[PDB]
Amino acid sequence: KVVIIGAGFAGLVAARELQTAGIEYEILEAKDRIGGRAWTEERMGRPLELGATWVHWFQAHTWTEIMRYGQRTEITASPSGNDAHWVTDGKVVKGTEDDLDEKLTAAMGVTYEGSEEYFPNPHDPLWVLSDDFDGPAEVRERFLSDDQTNAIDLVKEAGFDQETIDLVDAFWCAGYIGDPYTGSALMAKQWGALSDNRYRVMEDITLKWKLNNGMRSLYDGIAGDLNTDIRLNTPVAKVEHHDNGATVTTESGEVIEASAVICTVPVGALSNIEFSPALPDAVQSVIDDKWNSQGAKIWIKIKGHHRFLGYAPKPAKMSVVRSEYFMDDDTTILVGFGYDNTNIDLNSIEDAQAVINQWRDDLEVVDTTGHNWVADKWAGQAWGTLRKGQFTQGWSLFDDIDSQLFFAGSDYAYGWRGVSVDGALEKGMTTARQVINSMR
Ligand SMILES: Cc1cc2nc3c(=O)[nH]c(=O)nc-3n(C[C@H](O)[C@H](O)[C@H](O)COP(=O)(O)OP(=O)(O)OC[C@H]3O[C@@H](n4cnc5c(N)ncnc54)[C@H](O)[C@@H]3O)c2cc1C
Numbered sequence: 001k002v003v004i005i006g007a008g009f010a011g012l013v014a015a016r017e018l019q020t021a022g023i024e025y026e027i028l029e030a031k032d033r034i035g036g037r038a039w040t041e042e043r044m045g046r047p048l049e050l051g052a053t054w055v056h057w058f059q060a061h062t063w064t065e066i067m068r069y070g071q072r073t074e075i076t077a078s079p080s081g082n083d084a085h086w087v088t089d090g091k092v093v094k095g096t097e098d099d100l101d102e103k104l105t106a107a108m109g110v111t112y113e114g115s116e117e118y119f120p121n122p123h124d125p126l127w128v129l130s131d132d133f134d135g136p137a138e139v140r141e142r143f144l145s146d147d148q149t150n151a152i153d154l155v156k157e158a159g160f161d162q163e164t165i166d167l168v169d170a171f172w173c174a175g176y177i178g179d180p181y182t183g184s185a186l187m188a189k190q191w192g193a194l195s196d197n198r199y200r201v202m203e204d205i206t207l208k209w210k211l212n213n214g215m216r217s218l219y220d221g222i223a224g225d226l227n228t229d230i231r232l233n234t235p236v237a238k239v240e241h242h243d244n245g246a247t248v249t250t251e252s253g254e255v256i257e258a259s260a261v262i263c264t265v266p267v268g269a270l271s272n273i274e275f276s277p278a279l280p281d282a283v284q285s286v287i288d289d290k291w292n293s294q295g296a297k298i299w300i301k302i303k304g305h306h307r308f309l310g311y312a313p314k315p316a317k318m319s320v321v322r323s324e325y326f327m328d329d330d331t332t333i334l335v336g337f338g339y340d341n342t343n344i345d346l347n348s349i350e351d352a353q354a355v356i357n358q359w360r361d362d363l364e365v366v367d368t369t370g371h372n373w374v375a376d377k378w379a380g381q382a383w384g385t386l387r388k389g390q391f392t393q394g395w396s397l398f399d400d401i402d403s404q405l406f407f408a409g410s411d412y413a414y415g416w417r418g419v420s421v422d423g424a425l426e427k428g429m430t431t432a433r434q435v436i437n438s439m440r
C-alpha cells in the first residue's frame with residue numbers, strides 16, 4: 001500500500017526497508033530500467049558509468065551495500081600521477097598532478113574555513129540554525145552569509161593569484177556540475193566537514209575508487225532482494241496527498257490508492273507530476289529555481305596510452321578531464337565533467353576533440369559517449385548541487401509536508417547530499433523509517 005515513485009537507489013533501498021518491516025509496497029518506475037542516475041552500461045568496448053561512479057568506505061550507506069552485495073574487494077583506484085595541464089589566463093600551464101594538487105590543497109584550506117564551527121557533527125548541517133546552537137552570534141551570521149557567497153569568491157578574497165582562481169573555477173565547475181558562481185559555498189564547506197577537512201580525503205571519497213562490477217552490482221543487488229516486482233514503464237502523472245493516505249495516477253490513467261507515497265523523482269523532473277494540493281510555496285520556489293546541476297559528464301576515447309589530467313575554467317566545454325582506462329587496443333578512455341550541458345554534445349567526436357584541444361594539439365579522439373541527464377525528462381539535472389541560499393532554505397524544506405507524501409532522494413540527505421549515492425541510500429532508508437514509525 002506504500003507507493004514508491006522511482007527505482008533509483010533511494011526508491012530501491014526504501015522498498016527493501018519497508019519489506020523488512022512487513023509493509024506492503026509497490027515501486028513505479030517511468031523508465032524501462034532501474035538504477036536512475038546510477039547507470040552501468042557497455043559502451044566503447046567496456047562497462048562505463050553513465051552517471052554515479054566513485055565510492056568510499058567513509059560513506060556509510062554506500063559502503064554497507066558494497067559489503068552486502070559482495071563487492072568488498074571489487075574496487076579499483078582511478079589512475080594517478082598523470083601529466084597535468086591547466087588553463088589559466090587563456091594559456092595552458094603544465095605540471096605534475098602533485099603540483100596541481102598542492103595548489104588546490106592550499107585553496108581548500110580557505111574554502112573550508114568555518115566548517116569546524118558549523119559542522120561539529122557533519123551529519124547535522126543545520127545545527128547552527130537550531131535551538132541547540134550555543135556558539136557565538138557571529139558564527140550564525142557568517143553561516144547565513146556563506147550561503148550567499150560562492151566558493152570561488154572565498155579564494156579571491158583571500159588574495160590567491162589568478163592561476164589558483166582559475167584552478168578552483170575549473171574544480172568547482174565540476175563539483176557544482178554547473179555554474180559555480182551561482183553556488184552556495186556552504187556545500188563545499190560541508191564536503192570538507194565530511195572529509196575531515198582535508199582535500200586529499202575529499203578527493204579520495206568522491207573521485208578515486210570505482211566499482212569493478214559497476215553501480216549495477218549494487219542496484220541489481222537491492223532489486224534482487226525485493227519480493228514485489230518493480231513496475232517499469234509506469235510514469236506517475238499525479239499525486240493527491242492527504243493526512244491519512246494518498247492517490248497516485250499514472251500516465252495511462254491508472255489510479256492507485258496508497259497509505260503513503262515516497263517520491264524520489266528529482267527536482268529537475270518534478271514538473272512532470274501534478275500535486276494536489278499544490279506543494280508549499282517555499283518548496284515550489286526551489287523546484288522553479290532548480291538545483292545547480294546544469295552540467296554534464298562525458299567519456300572520451302583517444303589514440304595511445306596517455307596519463308592525462310586537464311583543468312579549465314568556465315565557460316569551457318569540460319572543466320576536469322582525467323584518464324580512467326588504458327585499453328587493450330592502444331587507446332585511453334578519459335572522463336570529463338562540464339558546467340553546461342548545452343555547450344557540448346557528448347556523442348559528437350568533434351566536440352570531444354574540442355575538449356581535448358583545450359590542452360593539447362597532438363591527441364586524437366576516436367570515440368566519445370555520454371548521457372545528457374539534464375535533457376532527460378526523468379532527471380532534468382545531473383547530481384544535485386546548491387545555489388546560493390539553498391543550503392539553509394532549499395533541500396531541508398522538502399521535509400516540511402504535512403501529508404503522507406514524503407520526498408526522498410540524494411538531494412535531501414543530511415550527509416553526502418546530491419553528489420553521492422550515499423545520500424540516496426541514506427534518505428531512501430530514513431524516509432522508509434518515517435513511514436514505518438508513523439504506522440507503528
Ligand atoms: C553525471 C553524474 C555522476 C555521478 N557520479 C557519482 C559518483 O561518482 N559517486 C556517487 O556516489 N554519486 C554520483 N552521482 C550521484 C548519484 O547518481 C545520485 O546521487 C543517486 O543516484 C540519486 O538517486 P535517487 O534515488 O535519489 O534519484 P534517481 O536516481 O534520479 O532516481 C529517481 C528515479 O525516478 C524515476 N522517475 C522520475 N520521474 C518519474 C515519474 N514521473 N514517475 C516514475 N518514475 C519517475 C527516474 O527514472 C529514476 O529512476 C552522480 C550523478 C550524476 C548525474
Ligand SMILES: NCCc1ccc(O)c(O)c1
Pocket residue numbers: 053054171172174175202203206207320337419
Ligand atoms: N563524481 C563527481 C564528484 C566531484 C566532481 C568534481 C570535483 O571537482 C569533485 O571534488 C567531486
